[PDB]
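Obj: model holo form, ligand = CP6.
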Amino acid sequence: QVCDVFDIYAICVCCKVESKNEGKKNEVFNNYTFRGLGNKGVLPWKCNSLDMKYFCAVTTYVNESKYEKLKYKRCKYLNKETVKLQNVVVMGRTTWESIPKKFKPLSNRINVILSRTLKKEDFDEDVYIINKVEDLIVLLGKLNYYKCFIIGGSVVYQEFLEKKLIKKIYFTRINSTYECDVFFPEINENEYQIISVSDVYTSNNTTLDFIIYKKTNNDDEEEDDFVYFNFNKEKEEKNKNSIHPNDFQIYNSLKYKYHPEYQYLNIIYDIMMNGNKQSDRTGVGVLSKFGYIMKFDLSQYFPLLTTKKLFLRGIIEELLWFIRGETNGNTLLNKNVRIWEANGTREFLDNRKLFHREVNDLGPIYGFQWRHFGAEYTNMYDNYENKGVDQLKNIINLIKNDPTSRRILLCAWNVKDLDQMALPPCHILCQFYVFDGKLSCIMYQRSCDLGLGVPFNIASYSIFTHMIAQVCNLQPAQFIHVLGNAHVYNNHIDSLKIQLNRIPYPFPTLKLNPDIKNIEDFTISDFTIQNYVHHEKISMDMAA
Amino acid sequence: MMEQVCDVFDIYAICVCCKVESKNEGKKNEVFNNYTFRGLGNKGVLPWKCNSLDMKYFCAVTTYVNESKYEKLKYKRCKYLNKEKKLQNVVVMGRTTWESIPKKFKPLSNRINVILSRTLKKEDFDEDVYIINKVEDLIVLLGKLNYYKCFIIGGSVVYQEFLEKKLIKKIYFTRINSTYECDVFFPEINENEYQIISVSDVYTSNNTTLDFIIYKKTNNDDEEEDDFVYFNFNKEKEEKNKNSIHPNDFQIYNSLKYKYHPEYQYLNIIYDIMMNGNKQSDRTGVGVLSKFGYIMKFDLSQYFPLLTTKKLFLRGIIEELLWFIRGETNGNTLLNKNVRIWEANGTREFLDNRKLFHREVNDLGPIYGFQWRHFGAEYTNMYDNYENKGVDQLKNIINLIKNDPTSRRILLCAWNVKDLDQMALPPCHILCQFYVFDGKLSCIMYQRSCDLGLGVPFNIASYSIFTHMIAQVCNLQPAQFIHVLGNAHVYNNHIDSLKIQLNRIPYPFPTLKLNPDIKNIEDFTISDFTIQNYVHHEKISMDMAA
Ligand SMILES: NC(=O)C1=CN([C@@H]2O[C@H](COP(=O)(O)OP(=O)(O)OC[C@H]3O[C@@H](n4cnc5c(N)ncnc54)[C@H](OP(=O)(O)O)[C@@H]3O)[C@@H](O)[C@H]2O)C=CC1
Ligand SMILES: NC(=O)C1=CN([C@@H]2O[C@H](COP(=O)(O)OP(=O)(O)OC[C@H]3O[C@@H](n4cnc5c(N)ncnc54)[C@H](OP(=O)(O)O)[C@@H]3O)[C@@H](O)[C@H]2O)C=CC1
Ligand SMILES: O=c1ccn([C@H]2C[C@H](O)[C@@H](COP(=O)(O)O)O2)c(=O)[nH]1
Ligand SMILES: O=c1ccn([C@H]2C[C@H](O)[C@@H](COP(=O)(O)O)O2)c(=O)[nH]1
Ligand SMILES: CCc1nc(N)nc(N)c1-c1ccc(Cl)cc1
Ligand SMILES: CCc1nc(N)nc(N)c1-c1ccc(Cl)cc1
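Output (holo structure tokens):
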């Protein structure tokens, strides 16, 4: 338990490994997916401004007031008193030798270098050199530092990991593939666990995030006022006994959960712990809550859930289908997009009292309201050109010609046509906001199937936001999701319980064909999802 | 380094005050301030009979102790006095107060009871209590006892003297938002000596709202911690309008430790917009600071969310609401009641600019009222009878709530894309969605455009009232009113007034009473509504142009 005494940590940054058998994509994913450390003396990627900023901020940050407990602990262990504190950076010759003279030594950091062929006289008096691994255990009990960061390379990391000389690991995850020759050791989840995950970012054309591994352990006035003000709160949660929190060992073991995906995950948890039991229109049971709001920064990442596998061909086609103004269910079925199949059958239509509606003729739904709101619906084959209000065209002109307008709204809930619809829309409306050349969008959803629908809904409107943004020569900003009746079907509980204990991966990114400048010109091949790392698919309905 | 007695011995005061039955009639405009709540007792007992919630609060505070903190407290008092079985708090009361406590509750449970008295001595008491005949003897006793905190619990004479001697570290003050007959009062609190540092959520108990505030005596694993500092390395960008808007102007707003009063959801949004809002031009040309996407939640079962940091009247908005329900679009109806909410939007000038050259003055077009009762019908003019024309959304939602409460399709939508250009102006309140659980009705309203300084305050009241109305005629109880804000903005000329407002501390919300006899949403009239116990700050003019 020495790595805990001298505060020895390891900070790194790994990308994804390429291949000669199969490059650019992987079948299965796990933490070991991120391991690329370097290539030909240098780093796999040119450089990463943000990670660089992170590295600096960590290896040069010290809390003088905390140096106390560490002193009152390091010496007592040493069995001897330690004879403007900084931190220490330990690296191998190769590592040091790769740093440019202009930047070496590393400012405000007590440099150290492992090597069996380097004179202590070939360098500074501030730059300490060692011949062995334990030779560092001493140098520490003799110096006055705050923390010790092992910054590589591969050789160094390996040795320290095996000898259990690492307290925690600050792992930067660069979500992109590069050529490599050296890699980071496979972290053993029995001797190291993740405790915190950060927000996701985009730097130098790649998303990345920061996670923290922790060696498995295996005024006060205001404080009291806080207790008084919570005197009327509830001891436990309603579904406490129904949903056992001990089933979320992973979810709770996390201290910092800044990864955007938790906005989705936290809501699942809030509904499971505090949701109300209700019986919906399907006899099936649900846990529901009312009113939530999620926000996703599309400029930093594409919010495609990573705690399970998601497909997008279908939802993109649906989006293209809406844009064309179609209401013909067959168009989608012939492309094997069966999102609306159950809603267009003879039985469903008849139960909806639409006895005179042809099978798969969904009536005046999304597409029809977006391009012909107000027009008289006849059948899915009629020509509606120039009939009704073309809201889509209108909001796009507004965005271009009057960005600050507060009436840029696309509404699908046409009260007059509701009963003619196979089913009323769940996505009531989209509202747009434009500022400093950036486009944001809010979408209000009246009914939210958290386990199955919402995941797609998020991807759906994020993609749409990008589309509207690109044809308006703007950059996407935020996709804002407002949930009204938010529910979790009971048959999704066990599945969500499993998903809740999975740690998100850095989000992927969405790439659109840059040449498409008309909302109506997009085709399926114009959409590409890049670097999508995810946990394996999950059957929400375990009942198979 | 002047060690203060109240700090060393942690002496606090906890009380509860109602409003006093003494209001002059000269000016029907009653002024309010903290001194509004001062009633302590009447004819030997409490002005109100009992208050379950405050009692629970009182009990929780005066019996709560933090074992792991005594250790440090003990050292503090020892060094002060030159000194080097379950832990309880001490409660101190005047003899009259002690005699007002029912026998089955004497002495106050799990608490070292101390009583001040000159007429009675220990021999006059059978209970396990300490008797003292002067203030200094309390300090002495405390110096000899093992206790967590010391609470002065009344009555008026006792509060009075302890406050005067500045022996109070903090005052846990409960505000009962109602009036009762009183003969004893809490002393007037001097603002230079005491400042409010925390206000609680608002609650309803025993037919009255109440909140809890705290006054403070005026001045004059470390691992997870560092990780946090790390995870905030890129928060480099502070606040864009912080330099434009000096947060030093929010001295009082920023001094409050705990801001749990529901009014702060609104107040916090104004603050967020002011510090981080985006500057933008407006269709009006005024210019605004704006953000996109907010949500506020108000518990209508616990209070009626009418802002107290400024004065508001609801006669107008109530008549507007009734006006909506009747499906009217005729502006004259409101103007004849001296409600000018829509006057500017129905002028010849305004209508012409909307390109509505063939629209009669004050004929607002197919707006809210028309959409709620006739969505889909072709608007003709405001005098037309649209009986059984279009979709009566209002009647529909009332039926879904009654016969299919779990429906996730209970929405009232005003945004009729087809009629938009025919309206004096498109609706700001896009839709209302209802949720029903355990005999309780909740309501979400989406506002596409929100003027925080002027409209929102009224909008919060309008829909909260509407929710009470729908719930009643549906035999349900009002639960939450959820307000979703799309484009939230603060007009540039409202800023100075909003700065003032943000530095005012909220009073407990009032309550709304509906004539319990009305069973149909259409049978309501202006005298079926009653706002009670509205305590508020001085009215403010958002636009100080003269
Ligand atoms: N992603 C990341 O965080 C990092 C990536 N890198 C990348 O990885 C590559 C360098 O890693 P790597 O090849 O492993 O080289 P190293 O930096 O790990 O240095 C290895 C050398 O250091 C000395 N050394 C290490 N451990 C000991 C020991 N226990 N006792 C005595 N001497 C020791 C020896 O040098 P000697 O010859 O003097 O005996 C040894 O040959 C580069 O391509 C670089 O770009 C480097 C650091 C961090
Ligand atoms: N709203 C609230 O939070 C509270 C309200 N109350 C209410 O207020 C009323 C009681 O208040 P009040 O009339 O002022 O009476 P008090 O409870 O304050 O008791 C006053 C009496 O206590 C003793 N006393 C006070 N100070 C001293 C001292 N320094 N030395 C010796 N004895 C002292 C003396 O009793 P003695 O005659 O024996 O000499 C004195 O007459 C009741 O109506 C009660 O219901 C009470 C507590 C809290
Ligand atoms: O894009 C969609 C489509 C449907 N649903 C869900 C919500 C409900 O669980 C069910 C529709 O039933 P109603 O809400 O209309 O009753 O489908 C979604 O979450 N997202
Ligand atoms: O009930 C209402 C009606 C209007 N407004 C405000 C919002 C805008 O500042 C202005 C209307 O402008 P547009 O959003 O329509 O452009 O009135 C409100 O806050 N609440
Ligand atoms: C800024 C890159 C960086 N980021 C992280 N998270 N860890 C590291 N160990 C390094 C690093 C790579 C090469 C040298 Cl030579 C020194 C430090
Ligand atoms: C429970 C009422 C209550 N609430 C608060 N907040 N403070 C108090 N001091 C009292 C109180 C009143 C009379 C007696 Cl006799 C004892 C305590």
